[PDB]
Amino acid sequence: CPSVIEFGKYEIHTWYSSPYPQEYSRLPKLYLCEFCLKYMKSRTILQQHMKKCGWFHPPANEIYRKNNISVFEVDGNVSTIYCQNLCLLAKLFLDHKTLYYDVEPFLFYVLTQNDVKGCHLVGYFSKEKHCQQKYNVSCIMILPQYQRKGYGRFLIDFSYLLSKREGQAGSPEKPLSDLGRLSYMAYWKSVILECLYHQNDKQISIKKLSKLTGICPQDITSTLHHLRMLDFRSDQFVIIRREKLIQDHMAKLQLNLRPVDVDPECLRWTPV
Ligand SMILES: COc1cccc(OC)c1S(=O)(=O)Nc1noc2cc(Cn3cccn3)cc(OC)c12
Ligand SMILES: [Zn+2]
């Protein structure tokens, strides 16, 4: 409780209960503006709002844009209502999402699929503005209708582009959602294989690989292990180069292609 939500052209059954107002949460189906994330108690209110509401995208600037794909760097201190609203939408699918009110100390990277009707929210990741114990992601969500389409990979990749460019290796803030866990593993496997191919006949340390990727060392060894590509050199965890697996991935990659892929050249601003 809540049970179902009306988001744009979709009706979505919630997986979890999100702390909404006592009167709004009680409702069977909760109505929402796919651009402003404002919750309304009826189908009729929604339609009245969709005539008034001038929003056809999130209340922020595009840190990224390539074709129909956009990343909106939404500052929690600036458009605070929307971000608090986003956290409430988030908590309907993310079990471990604790922060819903004090959004001002955070950043929200909002992924959108763009067309004539506007900038349709696909999902998001949140990042603390100043985190010494550096977690490049606190939360990461993908609306079910978008899950497994590769949008989740895109965010993970974008979070690492941000974190790696500012010199430090990063990780998501555990415990992840099981689909978040599953998407991070898929990413690490592809990245390491693709990165080892672009070295090809060049021996690289787990430390240098972590520098090139932005993935923290522990995440690399557990992934190399799963890839049946890990070993020891005393005080040194090492890469077993199964060169047939590296060439085969690259082959399938040219074939199947990437539908959503981060172009570092399409960023408006990257750190230093
Ligand atoms: C399972 O992930 C796969 C797996 C295979 C292929 C594939 O792409 C072809 C992908 S994904 O690349 O599309 N990523 C995601 N799909 O669903 C996700 C869901 C979440 C979290 N969540 C929990 C509730 C709402 N959201 C996070 C995600 O990634 C960060 C993804
Ligand atoms: Zn609105």
From Swiss-Prot:
It is found in: Nucleus; Nucleus, Nucleolus; Nucleus, Nucleoplasm; Nucleus, PML body. Autoacetylation at Lys-97 is required for proper function. Autoacetylated. A zinc finger (C2HC MYST-type) spans 30-55. Acetyl-CoA binds at S138, C139, I140, M141, I142, Q147, R148, K149, G150, Y151, G152, R153, S177. Histone acetyltransferase that acetylates lysine residues in histone H3 and histone H4 (in vitro). Component of the MOZ/MORF complex which has a histone H3 acetyltransferase activity. May act as a transcriptional coactivator for RUNX1 and RUNX2. Acetylates p53/TP53 at 'Lys-120' and 'Lys-382' and controls its transcriptional activity via association with PML. Component of the MOZ/MORF complex composed at least of ING5, KAT6A, KAT6B, MEAF6 and one of BRPF1, BRD1/BRPF2 and BRPF3. Interacts with RUNX1; phosphorylation of RUNX1 enhances the interaction. Interacts with RUNX2. Interacts with p53/TP53. Interacts with PML (isoform PML-4) and this interaction positively regulates its acetylation activity towards p53/TP53. This is Histone acetyltransferase KAT6A. It comes from Homo sapiens (Human). The gene is KAT6A.
